[PDB]
Structures are given as structure tokens and as C-alpha cells.
């Protein structure tokens, strides 16, 4: 272990940072760990390079529950992560007949687990209980709304937390490569052409290691052939600027989320509110040849805002973002938006992670399939990547995260197939 060399591709993003953090915590020697990314520090294009992410408990399968609970504990109690968890609660609400049904089911599932989640997860049946948790709302704004309130949840200062890990890693002596020195191009193989011995970057720099971890997020299926198990998709956000007076009225407000509208966060320290809508995501299919594919293939390739800073998002997303504002922040309907952005994740067909050794390449570990909801696992997801690397990962977890082509990841569990950027005008200003 003190002898084992590991390269983490995508080490500037969420799963890569966590993996590098846990390699150190488990006693790997820091000079033996190499972190590679296109972008330095917290990578500009990482899905974790954000003002804020939601912290909440999700319960779809067994792993989801264990991982959620452990991660919540570390956000609350881990010295490294504590400064970046804002435990302001999260309201999940609805007013549509079908949306309240989904919410009642969410509450029952928490109940049915029977391990105490209903203590910190409270049903809000009347507008007056909603207004007590969110005073900024008015009574007429919340007419007909029902809520499930997670007193345990809140939001995570995402980019700041990733930066904190990176500072820790640098202080311990981990090696880094960025730019074309850190841009993965292909694995390197022993004489057998199937045992991985390292990787090459686009400049020809060859890194040799016992294990290679591919934590390249939405770019993972573009870099190596995942047999179309993963479809990368974009979601959207924009920012609004509050006056100091308005910003004060919103301090410590809980995260508010409605699956038919979107969600928003309390102002950051500069008075900026991030607003998101909720929808099935955007694909951007384009001819590309991932390593290991026999031919160029039509696959969803992120259109990176870091690479194309004039990009915004589609006009259809301008409509739905302004609908979220009108529902949650009706007094701000005339505020101008800025920093319109597309942010990329990669869905699997069943919305579980893809964390496994590549079927044919020994010592090449995939660690992706984040499916748009894994940033909350920053403190602990790396623990299980290292467990897999070591051969100690539980069989139920390995099974849930295994190599498993065959499903429809374009629909995934979103209830509609992502629409493509080629059919959605308004985002490109080239
Ligand atoms: C709009 C939006 C809102 C979200 N909100 C939430 C939320 O509230 N809560 C939550 O839990 N999750 C949320 N998510 C999902 C969450 O952000 C992701 O699941 C998670 O951050 C993905 O982590 P990752 O490590 O797989 O990818 P990333 O963090 O994107 O890391 C991938 C890394 O790989 C690097 N890379 C790419 N290509 C190469 C290459 N060729 N060589 C080397 N490195 C490379 C990239 O630069 C990047 O640093 C949201 C996602 C979106 C889009």
C-alpha cells in the first residue's frame, strides 16, 4: 500500500478528489499518488465547480442509504468538510395532485426504513408550517403547497470543498499534472495488450502506475468505450444579484426544491442567488471515437462552458428558469440573470454509480456514472473506490456498481429521454 502507485484521472473533480483524499487517509504514500486533470485546482469544468449543491438523503437502493448517511455524518463532523456544509434545512414541496403523491411516497419510504429518518424529516401539510420554515414566502404564494422538510439537510459550498481537498493533497505531497500534461488520451498496456500499466496524456507524457482510476465525470464515456452504459447530460443554472437589503432578508433560508419547477439557494457571501430548473437534461451527440471503440460513434460529448465561455443555455431553459423564479422568488421577477451555464453529469440506465474494473483492462478502474446526484458523496465516495481498488468492496456494492451494459441511459430514471442541444436553439454564440 505504501508501495502502490495510483494515477487519478479527473483528480480535480468530485470523485477524483475524494479518491485521492481517501488514498492518503488509508496510508498510501503521497508521492505515489498522481492527480491529473485538464484544469487545475477545482477544475473549471468539474460539475463540482459550483457555488452550491443540495445535501439531502436519497433512498433508492441499499447503497444509496448507507452512502447518504455516512456522507451526512462527515459533512457534520469531519474537520476537513464541516466548514462547507450549511445546515439550513431543505424543503421539498409541490402543489400538483401528482406531485404531492410523489412527495407522500418520499415520506413513507423514509418512514418504512424504520431507522429514525422521520425525526429529521417532517411532513408539512399546511401553508402555516411552510411559512414557518420559509418566512420569505407569503401565504398566497404557498396556497395549496405541501412539503417534506429535511431538518438535517442544507447546501454544500461545492467548489470550496474541492479546493480544501486539493490544498490538503498538495500539503501532503501528492503529485499533480494539469493542462495537456494532465489530459488523458489512452491507457498504456504491458506486452499482453490487456494489463494496464499506466496512461498517456495528449502531449505524450507517459505516467506509469499500478492502478489507474478514471474519474472523468461526464467526459468518461468520451475517453474510453463504456459500451453506451453512460450518457452525458447537461443541466442549467443562472445567477441573480440581490441588494444588501434583499440579501439580508434571505439569510439562512432553507434550500427550496419543487420537482416540477427547479430549486434555489440562499445568497452567497456576495448576495448572489443561484437558481436551477428541473427537467430531464440535454444531450449533445457528436461523432467521437472513445479509446477502445472500433469506429467513430455517435455519443453525447459535453459542450464545456469552460472551453466555450460565450455559451449560455437554450432559450427553452430561459423559460423554465424564469418560471422557477416566479414561483419561488416572485418579488425578483424583474431581476436580470447572468452566468447562464450548462453543467455536465453522466447518467447510467438505473442511476447507480459505475465503479468497477474495466472488463478487459486489468488495473484500469472506472469511477463514474454519478447520475447527477453524487456531489453530496464527496466526503466518502473515495472510500469505496479504494476498497474496490484493494478488492475489499462489499459484494452488494460491487454488484450495484458493476459493468452492466444493456439499459437505456438516455432516459435513465428521468422519465423522458434527454433532448439534444442540436434541436434546442439559443445557447451557442460562436
Ligand atoms: C446543474 C446541476 C446541479 C446539481 N446539483 C446537485 C446537488 O444539488 N446535489 C448533488 O449531490 N449533486 C448535484 N449535481 C450532480 C453532481 O455535481 C455530480 O454528480 C458530481 O459532481 C460529478 O462528479 P464527477 O467526479 O463524476 O465529475 P466532475 O466533478 O465533473 O469531475 C470530472 C473531472 O474530470 C476532468 N476531466 C475531463 N476530461 C479529462 C481528461 N481528458 N483528462 C483528465 N481529466 C479530465 C474534468 O476536468 C473534471 O475535473 C448537480 C449537477 C448539475 C449538472
From TrEMBL:
<feature type="binding site">
    <location>
        <position position="14"/>
    </location>
    <ligand>
        <name>FAD</name>
    </ligand>
</feature>
<feature type="binding site">
    <location>
        <position position="376"/>
    </location>
    <ligand>
        <name>FAD</name>
    </ligand>
</feature>
<feature type="binding site">
    <location>
        <position position="47"/>
    </location>
    <ligand>
        <name>FAD</name>
    </ligand>
</feature>
<feature type="binding site">
    <location>
        <position position="184"/>
    </location>
    <ligand>
        <name>FAD</name>
    </ligand>
</feature>
<feature type="binding site">
    <location>
        <position position="15"/>
    </location>
    <ligand>
        <name>FAD</name>
    </ligand>
</feature>
<keyword id="KW-0285">Flavoprotein</keyword>
<feature type="binding site">
    <location>
        <position position="46"/>
    </location>
    <ligand>
        <name>FAD</name>
    </ligand>
</feature>
<feature type="domain" description="FAD dependent oxidoreductase">
    <location>
        <begin position="6"/>
        <end position="388"/>
    </location>
</feature>
<feature type="binding site">
    <location>
        <position position="374"/>
    </location>
    <ligand>
        <name>FAD</name>
    </ligand>
</feature>
<feature type="binding site">
    <location>
        <position position="375"/>
    </location>
    <ligand>
        <name>FAD</name>
    </ligand>
</feature>
<dbReference type="InterPro" id="IPR006076">
    <property type="entry name" value="FAD-dep_OxRdtase"/>
</dbReference>
<protein>
    <submittedName>
        <fullName>Fructosyl peptide oxidase</fullName>
        <ecNumber>1.5.3.-</ecNumber>
    </submittedName>
</protein>
<dbReference type="InterPro" id="IPR036188">
    <property type="entry name" value="FAD/NAD-bd_sf"/>
</dbReference>
<feature type="binding site">
    <location>
        <position position="54"/>
    </location>
    <ligand>
        <name>FAD</name>
    </ligand>
</feature>
<keyword id="KW-0560">Oxidoreductase</keyword>
<keyword id="KW-0547">Nucleotide-binding</keyword>
<dbReference type="Pfam" id="PF01266">
    <property type="entry name" value="DAO"/>
</dbReference>
<dbReference type="GO" id="GO:0008115">
    <property type="term" value="F:sarcosine oxidase activity"/>
</dbReference>
<dbReference type="GO" id="GO:0051698">
    <property type="term" value="F:saccharopine oxidase activity"/>
</dbReference>
<dbReference type="GO" id="GO:0050660">
    <property type="term" value="F:flavin adenine dinucleotide binding"/>
</dbReference>
<feature type="binding site">
    <location>
        <position position="370"/>
    </location>
    <ligand>
        <name>FAD</name>
    </ligand>
</feature>
<feature type="binding site">
    <location>
        <position position="37"/>
    </location>
    <ligand>
        <name>FAD</name>
    </ligand>
</feature>
<dbReference type="InterPro" id="IPR045170">
    <property type="entry name" value="MTOX"/>
</dbReference>
<keyword id="KW-0274">FAD</keyword>
<feature type="binding site">
    <location>
        <position position="43"/>
    </location>
    <ligand>
        <name>FAD</name>
    </ligand>
</feature>
<comment type="similarity">
    <text>Belongs to the MSOX/MTOX family.</text>
</comment>
<feature type="binding site">
    <location>
        <position position="48"/>
    </location>
    <ligand>
        <name>FAD</name>
    </ligand>
</feature>
<feature type="binding site">
    <location>
        <position position="45"/>
    </location>
    <ligand>
        <name>FAD</name>
    </ligand>
</feature>
